Every structure is written in C-alpha cells, then in structure tokens.
Amino acid sequence: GSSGSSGMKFQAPARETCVECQKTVYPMERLLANQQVFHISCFRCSYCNNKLSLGTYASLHGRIYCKPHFNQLFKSKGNYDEGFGSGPSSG
Numbered sequence: 556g557s558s559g560s561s562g563m564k565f566q567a568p569a570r571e572t573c574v575e576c577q578k579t580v581y582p583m584e585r586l587l588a589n590q591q592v593f594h595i596s597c598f599r600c601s602y603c604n605n606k607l608s609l610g611t612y613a614s615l616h617g618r619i620y621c622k623p624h625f626n627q628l629f630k631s632k633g634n635y636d637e638g639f640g641s642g643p644s645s646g
C-alpha cells in the first residue's frame with residue numbers, strides 16, 4: 556500500500572467537475588463558489604434547495620445555505636452547557 560493523496564483536488568481528467576451533481580462543468584456554466592466549481596443551477600441551499608447567486612448564498616463547511624437558513628442556524632446568542640472540561644492524569 557503506497558499512496559499520498561487526501562482531499563478533493565487534482566481532478567482525475569483535464570477539467571473541473573460540479574461538486575453538487577458531479578458532472579463535467581463547462582466554461583459556460585462554470586460558477587466559482589467558495590473556491591469550488593458550482594453549476595449556476597445546482598447552486599442552491601442544502602436546506603430548502605432554492606436558487607441562489609454569488610451574494611445570497613453562504614457556505615460554511617463546504618455545504619451551501621441561504622442567508623435565512625445560514626443565519627437561522629449559524630447566528631446565535633448566549634447559550635452554552637456545562638459539558639466541556641479538562642483534567643490531569645498520571646502518565
């Protein structure tokens with residue numbers, strides 16, 4: 556077992572591909588979004604699945620989202636639990 560690759564890059568072929576439908580994106584429908592090739596059509600919210608543009612969209616961990624949902628989920632206020640915690644241990 557001898558390899559050395561990790562991550563989405565180095566398109567096998569000699570072109571780009573849609574990170575939504577996984578299809579060969581042409582130079583006519585190539586829409587750059589979050590440093591990734593997206594289809595002017597595919598470009599939608601992974602929550603409601605609505606058409607978006609290079610201004611109303613919002614990506615976080617690779618997935619797209621509409622301002623509404625993006626903020627409705629992302630944005631927030633004072634709210635935390637007493638879960639987190641650390642402690643020493645003999646080593």
Ligand SMILES: [Zn+2]
Pocket residue numbers: 573574575576577578593594597
């Ligand atoms: Zn597509």
Ligand SMILES: [Zn+2]
Pocket residue numbers: 600601602603604605620621623624625
């Ligand atoms: Zn949405």
